[PDB]
Amino acid sequence: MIQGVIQKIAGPAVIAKGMLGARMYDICKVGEEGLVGEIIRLDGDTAFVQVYEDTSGLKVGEPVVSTGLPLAVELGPGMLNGIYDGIQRPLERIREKTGIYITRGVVVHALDREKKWAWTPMVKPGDEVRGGMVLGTVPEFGFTHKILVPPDVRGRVKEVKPAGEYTVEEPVVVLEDGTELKMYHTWPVRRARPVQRKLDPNTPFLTGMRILDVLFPVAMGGTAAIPGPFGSGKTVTQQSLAKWSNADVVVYVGCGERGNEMTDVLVEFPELTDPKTGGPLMHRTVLIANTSNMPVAAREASIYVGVTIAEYFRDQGFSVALMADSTSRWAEALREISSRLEEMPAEEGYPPYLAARLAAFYERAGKVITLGGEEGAVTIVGAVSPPGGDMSEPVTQSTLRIVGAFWRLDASLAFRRHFPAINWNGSYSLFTSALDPWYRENVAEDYPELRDAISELLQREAGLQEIVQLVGPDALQDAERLVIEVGRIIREDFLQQNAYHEVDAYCSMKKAYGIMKMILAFYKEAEAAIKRGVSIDEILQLPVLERIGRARYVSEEEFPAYFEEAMKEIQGAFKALA
Amino acid sequence: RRVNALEQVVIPGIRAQIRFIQQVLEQREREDTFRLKRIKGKIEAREAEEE
Amino acid sequence: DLLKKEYTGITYISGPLLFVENAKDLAYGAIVDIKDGTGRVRGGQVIEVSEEYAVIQVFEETTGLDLATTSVSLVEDVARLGVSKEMLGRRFNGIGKPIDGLPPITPEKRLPITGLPLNPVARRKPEQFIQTGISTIDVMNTLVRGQKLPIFSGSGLPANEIAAQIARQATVRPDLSGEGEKEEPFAVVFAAMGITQRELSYFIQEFERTGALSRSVLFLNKADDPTIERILTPRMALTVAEYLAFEHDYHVLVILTDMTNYCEALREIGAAREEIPGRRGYPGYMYTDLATIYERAGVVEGKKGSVTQIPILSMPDDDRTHPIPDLTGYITEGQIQLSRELHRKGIYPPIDPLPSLSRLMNNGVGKGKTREDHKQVSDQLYSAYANGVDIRKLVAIIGEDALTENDRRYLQFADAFERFFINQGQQNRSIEESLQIAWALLSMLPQGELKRISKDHIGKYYGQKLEEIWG
Amino acid sequence: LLKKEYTGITYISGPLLFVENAKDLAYGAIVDIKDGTGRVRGGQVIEVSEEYAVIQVFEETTGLDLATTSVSLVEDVARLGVSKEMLGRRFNGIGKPIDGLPPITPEKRLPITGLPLNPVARRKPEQFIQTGISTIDVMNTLVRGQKLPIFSGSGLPANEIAAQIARQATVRPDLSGEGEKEEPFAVVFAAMGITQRELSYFIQEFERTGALSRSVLFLNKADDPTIERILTPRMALTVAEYLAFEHDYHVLVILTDMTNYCEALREIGAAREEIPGRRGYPGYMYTDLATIYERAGVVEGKKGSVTQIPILSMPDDDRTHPIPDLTGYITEGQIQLSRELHRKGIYPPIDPLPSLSRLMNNGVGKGKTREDHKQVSDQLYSAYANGVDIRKLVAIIGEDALTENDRRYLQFADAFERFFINQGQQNRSIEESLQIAWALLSMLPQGELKRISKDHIGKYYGQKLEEI
Ligand SMILES: Nc1ncnc2c1ncn2[C@@H]1O[C@H](COP(=O)(O)OP(=O)(O)OP(=O)(O)O)[C@@H](O)[C@H]1O
């Protein structure tokens, strides 16, 4: 291949010479240690390579070998229940070779070449196949993995292996032109996988949190952004989404964050049960981990690897949820690379093409009809970490132009231990109107009216909050004090949700609907009883108020009886009242 | 009540806004200085192509 | 000519740029085709030519290009687009190639996409009132035929719905003007820059429901498309619009989805070349580049056709002093600004009247065009709403109970104005309905406060009660 | 091995010098610069190419010239010699003794940069550490293996709190069971940009307590060259990692001031002509800070641990300054000192409201400690937030807008501080503090205790203030 020597070393940037014939965005192997790098600039006889590993100790004159292919991942059976590096290297297969520390230069295949899988053919000789079609099935941890034709392959079938057990590298289908199809194939991470058509998202993505499911919903092909300062609760929210959502496969991308947050997932997940299949929770999860003390240039590749794997699972008909832990770290890596290239920055040192990269990443989500004729979906929830909580920073403002929902976190609520600390005045969702027909048949026919009424109550309380702060709560009349107390009840008993409690961590739709109905029934009864001269003090001391406060700690199997008893008590206690 | 409200709410917010605006303007000035330095380096390097 | 010349000898590839040395025979601004080793062909444009080397910007991505097998060949000296009358009802990508599956069109002419400036002697004054069906636009910020009226939006604000509603409900009123002939429907040219699949699907479904896809031309540049293609899309769209309007007497309505993406692409190219920046890193020639796009709308003396522009742009952080809204306001002829406070209260369409403007409003309103009381009613409404906003500011300090009896009328006027005049929903209103509602609102104030209305109009129209309409 | 010297110096300007014909110089290597007078300076290669190599000098470049100066190679990777006998010694922050004792003999030579830990090889920090301070051990409890910084001010007693913690740190293997054994403990102390008075105070406290016999001090004064401030925490963390992961020691690492480290990093970065960041600080400060804080934790299959308590001061109490903002994104909590509590004489002035310990939930709970710990903590948080809120209401509106229900919140908020927060030089316990926490929850009614279950309320409700 194309072969040269190192000319200049400066940080993660290596300039090679004698590289005439190398192509842009290809993969090169740098030095005797065999590090991995990528071409990003060609200049005469030279080439500019960014290295994905540590560059300390390199010397001028070491060889550089160009592999002639772009960055690609291996897609096939054996990716579930796995933990991967930034460039798709199995960490558990690295620990058995290097110990507790991570050393550069170790090369491990992504898919295990020693496992035997049960093969079951579905095609026959004489058939013609196209890209995205299904050749056979392989059993996994409860799933049925389908062997897909690569999108660029077309031809007729000559011979098919019979049923049995084979490795992932044994050919199973041989075409007429001599092309051999194996159980896996490689795909470049910077190319989006093809589809037939895109569909309008029309089914909700159930997250298990009341505020995100009721007030600011997200659909089955939408994108959401959750920005906030440190300690707001982004990671807890994303992990609760990974634990409790209704997605078939969850892909978690730990881009540039702490290592304890990955060890917690690796340890606690095998002892949990997924909501829909009853098996271990880790059997449906794929982790891509690149911590903060790892090489910086590998942060950029991890996002593309995760989104490519999520797109691969979409082509099999599943519904995939992708969680990016931080995109600001990716922006920092882009800034570092641009600084090494000595390009002119636009704002805050960022390169001027950051928004294009962010728009290209978020556009891969959506509900599609696959090339095989099945329906699939990918949802992306990305977290932004603005410096000092400033929402005018370029990364936050470049994300708001493409996302369909915006879950804004607040430091004031997080300081007072009011979690999930979602600012319900600065947040919005653009999927509310399209999800109404689903609600009108899957929970109740009056759900949107109830939700709008509670939103109106919150707006009225927020309006009165300016008045109460300068005259005191006593100076207001009964009609305003009732609104204040009802708003406080809604805030402390419906929006708040403990993610560590045994029962309160997960909430269904019907439980939230029942709590909403109980709260509004109490409000209407109190509004009726106010006009009869009854004091606010007599109403606030009622024992039925504690029934609303403790309602969220009741389990799902016991909630309807509690709901009936609470409704009867609400209708009775005010009748007993004057 | 009016005196306490002014002295406890109005003044610190204005002070914080002033500090924020000063920081933004100083950062923009620093970026301009860096740009001017880079193009001065380019101008000096242009004349040394062939002496 | 009918010969092709290939320039091998590329010496530099980085970002969107590409250098070829011994290519002094390429004209400035010419279009080139870049052939890969595997046979893929990508477009390009010359932005600087010399006897030493030429500088070429690449439209698509640069993946797979190498310095040994890549070659550059010339297409044409001047960037031109092949237009026709039969392209109505088609769809194209950002560079004019068909994407609807139909065979390519047969060009009648080949026009340059940079265009030429209109002679100010050949222009004429736009004076045709357009009824958009929205009260805050028809009465206070009147839009005339031949106007550049951008929409200043935000992040989560519904600018697309407002643009679609304007395109759906746009009509002229020849009976009021005294013409009386049968109006023709507006031909629509729709140019998208970095649009998402959600907004594109919404626009496609809206145009399908309205049945306007038989009179529309579409230029689409999606979010996953190459960024540098956004430089060409408005120029092709405006070339098609100008051709139709000034060669076949069409009335063309042009919608540009997001000028912010165009400015981002311009900033990328300018920062690659390291020009002297303006504010926030944007290039210094952004004013001229934006002016070469907006100034291609208007009406020409001796011809029936017209071009109307509705650019849509999103203000970052809702900042009016950002360079893109600032330059757009300096170039265009007013703006329609959306308010987030009105959006949070459920008011649709959330059009804020005070920061809005219409420069050509005085040409299209008055006696013999709409009604003789239009301008005075608009002025009085503006003054009264400003007074109400100021009193709203005052009651945050002194409390509403400490007000005089006069200021409570202004407060109730502001509340009723926001709840009735602006909050109109999805219904279509004629100009008479909007003026009737406005006169109903003005009757809440005392008769002696109307300093900006002639006493004849007050005698003729004052006194109606709002309960006869929204009671 | 025999040495090699280069004489091809072609350009000296500021802190950088260029060396011609330096093909066999590795990247990041350590060099020794000698001049005509025989004085030796330090330097590090930061950029190497075919035409020249670029070396930044560890100190001032006065006296250098292009005729007599020569550059030699020391080692390709900067290494530190470590041994078990370092316990009780003092070092200047570069590895050389300052107590006048003979130098140690190196058991091993380890790279000071370190290597990232494999996330698979880690395990959950799950052991409680008794600090001897009541406001920490109850509401923001410190778990073995955590990195818990302290957010101080410009006139607040942070050094005294750190010294008290270092004096009173224990393991307490009684309540969760654990090994019930006498376990070794060590403290590694690093100070950057310290003054003479603080140096004397620190050494006097360590000598008077007697904790010097199990400690290693890396003390860097403010008049030292600024590179020795950069390498100071890395050597301390290298020693701590060696001790913990090769001798099963439970080490504790205290970093005196990260602000001086950040200012030295900015001064070094500005000399290499790099694009500045938010307030002139370098744009890669997140990665540089992360390479320090990420070297703590626990390792599966081993007994040792590393716990870090950095101390930093917020300039003008600005929580949005780049240094505290970037520190909060990496560490697992914060302890924030309040100036208002210090104004009224309360020691230690720890403000519970903005303090947080993220690893609390697995370090306390059923069997690990008292069962009621989590509900007690969160009820105290909610009640304190309400009390401070209505107190801020009173300071504007006045006492006329208070019912007895709100007056109870006011009395609770005024009560909490002087009994629990103020402790002076005491060495209190955990079971001591939990009864005091239950006592203050007794004054509020039962209906206010919504989050606490009826079982825990039924078992423990009702007790007066036990301060005597
Ligand atoms: N839903 C919740 N229920 C209970 N406690 C919560 C919840 N969300 C957050 N917390 C608390 O707040 C802390 C916030 O930690 P988390 O890692 O979620 O924050 P973050 O915003 O992702 O931080 P960082 O920016 O530092 O990565 C948690 O450790 C926990 O103590």
Ligand SMILES: [Mg+2]
């Ligand atoms: Mg986090």
